[PDB]
Design a protein around this ligand. Sequence first.
Ligand SMILES: *[C@H]1C(C#N)=C(O)[C@@H](C)[C@@H]2CCc3c(nn(C)c3-c3cccnc3)[C@@]12C
Ligand SMILES: *[C@H]1C(C#N)=C(O)[C@@H](C)[C@@H]2CCc3c(nn(C)c3-c3cccnc3)[C@@]12C
Lengths: 121, 121
Amino acid sequence: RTFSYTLEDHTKQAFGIMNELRLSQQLCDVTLQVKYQDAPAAQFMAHKVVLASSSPVFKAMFTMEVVSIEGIHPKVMERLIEFAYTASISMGEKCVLHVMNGAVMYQIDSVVRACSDFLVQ
Amino acid sequence: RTFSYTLEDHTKQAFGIMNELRLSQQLCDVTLQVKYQDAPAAQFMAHKVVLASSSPVFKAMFTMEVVSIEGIHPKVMERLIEFAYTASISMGEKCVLHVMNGAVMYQIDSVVRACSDFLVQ
Ligand SMILES: *[C@H]1C(C#N)=C(O)[C@@H](C)[C@@H]2CCc3c(nn(C)c3-c3cccnc3)[C@@]12C
Ligand SMILES: *[C@H]1C(C#N)=C(O)[C@@H](C)[C@@H]2CCc3c(nn(C)c3-c3cccnc3)[C@@]12C
């Protein structure tokens, strides 16, 4: 007989740690430079393999690097990265469209579907 | 008002992709050399930030590198890495103790508790 076991919460817990690591800027191997049209330049350190696992666009991009990002607002990028590491996203209603546009841009389909479904209303 | 959304399955899905990436040997930044006492040398490519998020011992170790691993059996290491990326682990009963010893060695407490609870019986 062969024993087997699954920890139901493991993925949620491992992501918690991965988020700590990003916040401590530990083990990061990418820096996203978001320069965008009158808004101040922002930088976001992250882990390539985590970004790739949430976005086909990031996966395509990566399969210490500094990446220039045009065409998306830093605050929008910030929220998408948070989603990549936390499985949740928040914005103030008067902006759920801007977020959606970022999520469309990065093929984060679950976020797109969420904003879209909410915007319809 | 501020909108918020959580994708319940995101962590399970992102890990699925991270596992694909490891299997395709994409974005890896560590190679674990497991040489152990009469057994053949084995190598395991992985992502530091994923190993770190499942093991305090790996986190301590990392906070393309080749790491020499002594004192643990390659097949045991293999199963622990699988657990790190899949949240599940399997072995053939006549070996759940060997696995437990590896899991103890790497402070993967949920695996230790699982084998321990099963061994008691
Ligand atoms: C509006 C908002 C709210 N409420 C947010 O929660 C965040 C997510 C938005 C970031 C992007 C943004 C916002 N307000 N504006 C006017 C923009 C913007 C500006 C220029 C180009 N694209 C977007 C926020 C702050
Ligand atoms: C026994 C086993 C079963 N059934 C497994 O599923 C895997 C996880 C074991 C790997 C380690 C191992 C096993 N059998 N032996 C004798 C060892 C071993 C040998 C020497 C030192 N430590 C462990 C497996 C194959």
